[PDB]
Amino acid sequence: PLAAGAVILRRFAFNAAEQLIRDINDVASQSPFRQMVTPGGYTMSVAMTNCGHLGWTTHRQGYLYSPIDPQTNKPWPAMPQSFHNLCQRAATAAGYPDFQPDACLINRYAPGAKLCLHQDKDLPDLRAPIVSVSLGLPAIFQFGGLKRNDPLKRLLLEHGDVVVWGGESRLFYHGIQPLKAGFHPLTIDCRYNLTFRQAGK
DNA sequence: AGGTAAAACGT
DNA sequence: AACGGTATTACCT
Ligand SMILES: O=C(O)CCC(=O)C(=O)O
Ligand SMILES: [Mn+2]
């Protein structure tokens, strides 16, 4: 195990990946990738979009799961069936058979892009896991503990890898180190990540 | 009283 | 470049 309640399913999504990427492109044709601006005024290096009922976003006052894309003023695209099916299968393999996600944050990393150590914090009256799917170029994933200075595990995540955490590890600090440039036959020059959560009801 | 920003420069 | 300061506060509910 990666941690209590956490596991990495290596290449779990490899067979599903071509279809997942087609569906990323479809989602992004409606809610485009955008680099969000933090409350403090800095533009994130990762470009993001969302699908499902709820999408993660920043704005002046903090972070928010929102049912509407603040850029388009339309609902986020519905969660693709390919995404939902893959998520369900991975969650079940990881020991979370009852997971019902309603939120998928899609990350796009260009060379140099990073995601500094953070926690995916608890949502009110909800304790569902996180399912996190890697596509395209490889990245170094940091996975720590409850405190920022708890020692980090560093794990290369390659195309098709799925990481799941929850329960005792649900609030662990994690992140991505600056992406190395490279080639991948399906994504060409980037890495995508899918982050599934239950954020509503 | 407690949660959230920093999911973002210096050594 | 891996580690850690910063929020050691300010501003909300
Ligand atoms: O890209 C990854 O593997 C992790 C992404 C992540 O932590 C997030 O979007 O919250
Ligand atoms: Mn995260």
Side-chain angles (χ1 to χ4, degrees), chain A residues 7-18 20 82-95 131-135 158-164 196:
Chain A
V7 56
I8 177 167
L9 309 165
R10 283 193 179 82
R11 307 296 191 162
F12 190 92
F14 187 92
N15 289 168
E18 291 191 37
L20 296 176
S82 66
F83 281 30
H84 193 275
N85 194 23
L86 185 282
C87 184
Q88 169 273 320
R89 292 176 50 239
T92 298
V131 175
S132 190
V133 185
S134 296
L135 302 160
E158 306 188 83
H159 181 251
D161 290 353
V162 180
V163 185
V164 182
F196 297 90

Side-chain angles (χ1 to χ4, degrees), chain A residues 48 105 107 109 115 118 120 132 134 141 157 165 174 176 191 193 195:
Chain A
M48 290 172 161
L105 171 62
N107 297 126
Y109 299 78
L115 201 55
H118 64 278
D120 282 38
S132 190
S134 296
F141 181 66
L157 300 185
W165 64 106
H174 59 281
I176 292 283
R191 173 179 182 264
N193 194 257
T195 296

Side-chain angles (χ1 to χ4, degrees), chain A residues 129-185:
Chain A
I130 295 158
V131 175
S132 190
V133 185
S134 296
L135 302 160
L137 291 176
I140 300 170
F141 181 66
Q142 303 171 329
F143 199 73
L146 291 178
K147 293 173 183 167
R148 190 167 173 270
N149 299 345
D150 288 338
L152 302 180
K153 293 180 175 193
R154 280 177 174 83
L155 307 146
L156 194 74
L157 300 185
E158 306 188 83
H159 181 251
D161 290 353
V162 180
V163 185
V164 182
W165 64 106
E168 287 180 25
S169 59
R170 73 196 188 281
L171 299 181
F172 284 13
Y173 277 89
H174 59 281
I176 292 283
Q177 300 186 184
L179 193 79
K180 188 180 185 220
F183 176 82
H184 193 274

Side-chain angles (χ1 to χ4, degrees), chain A residues 37-48:
Chain A
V37 180
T38 59
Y42 291 109
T43 299
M44 293 174 69
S45 60
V46 174
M48 290 172 161

